[PDB]
Symmetry: C4
Subunit: 387 residues, 4 copies
């Protein structure tokens, strides 16, 4: 019954289109939730889309000023992958920061809400609140904003608390059926860890996070489910996946330290290793969240100084808006597949023709077959949309 993820990783030549919600285009006519920070997590049968709602729909007076990150009205929305967030969507918890797990038996939802300086993380398993923890650093308590990983019934979630531009207290929480059985402080050379994209790498869990303080390379967290040991490093690929960053010719990376190159900010992204190579996704624009591309870097997991990429796919065209991206793993007949979602942010603080901020999602899954090219942007025309 419990998921162990003991199958090997599927061979990947690239990624094929999997799902698209068209949320903003459907919002022009119809009642669609205002969302941001989405992710995808699958039970053994089907996949689900999650998002942090803003307590309002897009064609709504309350969609004004929905660029704010933390409000009391934010809830975690949960639909089947493909079903857009309409008025029949279930909100499973109060959360302006979220992470969701299926251990093979039931869903685990990790939900953070409340005051910025005194925040509660609620742990809801099988529809019941099982445990809760208060912010330890008395700062903005935040979690992965993506799917977490359960192996043998033990789910791991990464939680950060403290300064976003300085030393912060990151904890790895071990949850069994909604109950916190252990809490390990982050160890290793990753100095700043935030919004980890975690995937099962049996016998443990590997997380690729964002360094929001001093690195454009992505921190790596390796979690051993049995021993509970934590080790930290950075993605060694010379092509860094964080935005902002330097250009490919000028960007540099380090196997153990942040590269100190346009690292003061960041975006949620993902990466996974295929032997010594790394499969990564990032925004095409080096400074803004415009476009999205995925590629494989040869020896990009074991060698800094490697800027040799291949199998590049354009997910979102460079002229179109992207946002958070994360990984999620789907068990196959014989192997574990790696899939990723891209959040397509539209609205305020970058497009001022509307008063709201919302997102769409495009989902791609790894394939061992062949694929073509294309681009799958949000596609809404905000000049004609209600304000």
């Amino acid at each position: 019954e419990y998921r162990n993820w003991s199958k090997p990783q599927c061979g990947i030549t690239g990624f094929a289109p999997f799902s698209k919600d068209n949320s903003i285009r459907l919002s022009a006519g119809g009642d669609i939730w205002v969302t941001r920070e989405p992710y995808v997590s699958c039970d053994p049968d089907k996949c689900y889309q999650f998002a942090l709602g803003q307590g309002t729909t897009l064609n709504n007076v309350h969609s004004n000023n929905t660029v704010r990150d933390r409000t009391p009205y934010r809830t975690l929305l949960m639909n089947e992958l493909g079903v857009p967030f309409h008025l029949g969507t279930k909100q499973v918890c109060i959360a302006w920061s979220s992470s969701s797990c299926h251990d093979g038996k039931a869903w685990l939802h990790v939900c953070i809400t409340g005051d910025d300086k005194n925040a509660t993380a609620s742990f809801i398993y099988n529809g019941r609140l099982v445990d809760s923890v208060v912010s330890w650093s008395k700062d903005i308590l935040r979690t992965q904003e993506s799917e977490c990983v359960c192996i043998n019934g033990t789910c791991t979630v990464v939680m950060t608390d403290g300064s976003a531009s300085g030393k912060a207290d990151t904890k790895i929480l071990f949850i069994e059926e909604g109950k916190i059985v252990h809490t390990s402080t982050l160890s290793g050379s990753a100095q700043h860890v935030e919004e980890c994209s975690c995937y099962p790498r049996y016998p443990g869990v590997r997380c690729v996070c964002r360094d929001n303080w001093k690195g454009s390379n992505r921190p790596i967290v390796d979690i051993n489910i049995k021993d509970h040991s934590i080790v930290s490093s950075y993605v060694c690929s010379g092509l860094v996946g964080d935005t902002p960053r330097k250009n490919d010719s000028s960007s540099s990376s380090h196997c153990l330290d942040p590269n100190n190159e346009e690292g003061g900010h960041g975006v949620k992204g993902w990466a996974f290793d295929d032997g010594n190579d790394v499969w990564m996704g990032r925004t095409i624009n080096e400074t803004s969240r415009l476009g999205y591309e995925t590629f494989k870097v040869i020896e990009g997991w074991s060698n800094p100084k490697s800027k040799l990429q291949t199998n590049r796919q354009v997910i979102v065209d460079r002229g179109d808006r992207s946002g958070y991206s994360g990984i999620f793993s789907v068990e196959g007949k014989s192997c574990i597949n790696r899939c990723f979602y891209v959040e397509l942010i539209r609205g305020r603080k970058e497009e001022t023709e509307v008063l709201w901020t919302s997102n769409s999602i495009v989902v791609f899954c790894g394939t061992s077959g062949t694929y073509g090219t294309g681009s799958w942007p949000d596609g809404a025309d905000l000049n004609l949309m209600p304000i």
Copy 2:
């Protein structure tokens, strides 16, 4: 198969956020039922939200004059906890007063509708009408407006018939698979019992009710599911839970009689005992349904005169609107958890910029862990909402 509730009560240090519907905020764009008197009740798998609809949506001509409590068009709406009352919501019965039960096998709905002087209580178990009873006092027959409790197949419901300002005929009905197998009149020191927040306290059921006549101290009712024996008293804490009430310094309780302190009105509320202590919720405002706080009174269940607060939590900010609150119990892996919901009333008779009266809910569940602070109001701005 039949829920017994024989597990002990979970150790509670407070309550963690559980659910929020944002009903009024979603009403501004989208078709949402006009509801009042909500409550939460869970089958052994997931929790459900209930409310008494007004036969209309909010952006509707029929949402005017919806402050009225008893209309022929009121129905009991039932969704999964989290799903807002959209047009796909199932109205399970006709009722302007309702109570719902799950005994572990099927749902029991107690639904009261009809003429105020001659009302019918229909008992629907497993989707069928199994029994019905007429008013005995030929006055407004009313029930809990919250979850009832079923132990070993037998569900107990408190029903009141008579004046809200003088002796009323309160009966406890024992229902097995929808059939009324016993009816016992209320006996004990509580003289006005209405809208009882009942919870399982094995081997019995304990209800904390509203005295609309002479009390600010909430009445208590204890049912022996075995001897169909009913005992009545009041809550002993010197910090009373009813609204209106006196200051915290000037208030008193007797917990064998009403305190005769500003007791000429009331609001549905909850309290449960933790040894000699009492966990209780109330409005922060002593005169109006503004704000909501929960706290634990030291020896507040046994010592009239205890006013020692601890573990206070602000659920709704004092400036924000609250309403009915009630308790519901969720079975855990080793203990029984106590959770509560707060109805957030918005609209007429207190906010005259709209013509409708409706509510959202916020749900909190007892936690043995830690939590922070916050406030989770309705959040809808009625100045911009359709009138």
Copy 3:
């Protein structure tokens, strides 16, 4: 697995409120189907509501001229009892005349559509067309517009083909798993048989129909499931149940023939026997479909002269609009319960304030307990409703 209906009839002292959809009231804000001729049928777990949609919602340009009975766009809508016919409602077949069956294993739908003089009846069982029959009299082929009855896997449906103002070819069709295994021409003294309300009277099926030709007393069709025998008579009760009819002073019934009293025209209605007594429902208004009452006539199933009324209930107030009414049976724990629905027609012809014709439904179920009084009309204000 197959339903036999072998239990006796539950002792009925009257009827208690069961369900109310508030369709027209919710139509003012929200997308609700335009329907007419509804009915209720239940599978061994839930009750479903059916209606003949007009291919449009109420707030729609196509709701104009929805007073037409037979259009190519009419489909049979099927929702759970309580869920209003919103946009997510499933239309199970094309039909402007319908009847639905659950034999304990799967749903049977008898759907009539096509030309008025060459109508086609489709038989859909378990989601599949199993059989089809053409109109045999080349006039409006019609069926019960209510639930049909299956015993031991054999469902029986009453179909009429011919004129509404004279003799018509009424046939009784025996259907097994969607397949017509036998077709019996109507036999007996009933001269015009239409829109039968059938209930299981084990070992057979009893149908109370309307005479649209020469009688205000309701015809009876007795169907033997074992022998496929058909027997026809009239409800003997001197208080006739059809509309139009004579006043209670001048009503007469023959118990074998139509009474020749305002018998032209009619409304779909219901009746069932309780020993020698009859439980029947009818419009309060003798000439119009205004109001609804249910009562019991003492010795009304055997004595053509009995006018002794008792146990009268007002379902819809005298000034409010009723419509079609029909019976459906629910298997209880020890007996078979009889329930009835009343269609609440609103709109064109009678109410010229709107351009559409639609309906709401109110459902009552038999009870052995006590009950009060009340009135549950449609309750929509058509002066403010969109036209």
Copy 4:
């Protein structure tokens, strides 16, 4: 658990009405997806309707110029047959060309999206992306736009890549649990094959496709599942089924070569054999997609030159708009039934009073019983609908 379709073909005397969508009529009030190229597939329990959405609803600013066939926002929508494509509809994949299969265990969705010259076909089985293939001719890679057929766990899909007017590369793909196990190049005497309407003809699969280059007669692809052999021919029927075509008096067929009679364009249609006879459907207009008729041709499957017709049914009236039509097979108790759908296109490039292009569907199933006449058009009044 795997569907073998081993039962004989049902004796068919004609077709009976099964399902109607009314999508465009419901679009006037209510949020309904803009769709085109629909089809029907059934699992062992019930039937589902599929359509290629345009990423927008009809009463939407993005509904403008929805006449384009390939956009990044097009997705495959999936509801149960009878549920209109409302906002709760699940889009199961990104596709502007699609084909869907149920093999008895799980759904297989074949979805093509991306650039015109480098389109990607994604193979999604049981909710997971299993395989993927790129365009082989670097042109518009397209598939059946109807249900594919699975036998003994092996599903077969016909894929065309290349010129729409000229020789193109057609491949038959054998898919097992989402994985492409074999790929067969089209062989036989058919020169242009597109949008095949395939049905199980045990022990193989037979497809009736459209010749878009040189023929108004329809090509036939016979697929042997046992040994993956492909043979091709045309339909001998002197009454050809493609639109445009010549009139009945001047048409002809060869069933080894295209008839070279107004074969420059085409429409997706269906045919199946009844011994030596053929049941086919086509537009009543020989040059436009107006009306729809079905009939049987005596010796039409084995004799070019036959023009003898029987059992003609008008599905859509001659002056009403039709579109794509395809076949789907339903397993009965003892026989395999052949059913078909007709797409009712409304909107741009033929009706200029609206800016959108969308469709409704009507479904008919084969019957061994009797049936009447009728016409079941889309029925929306576009002069009154929003742009």
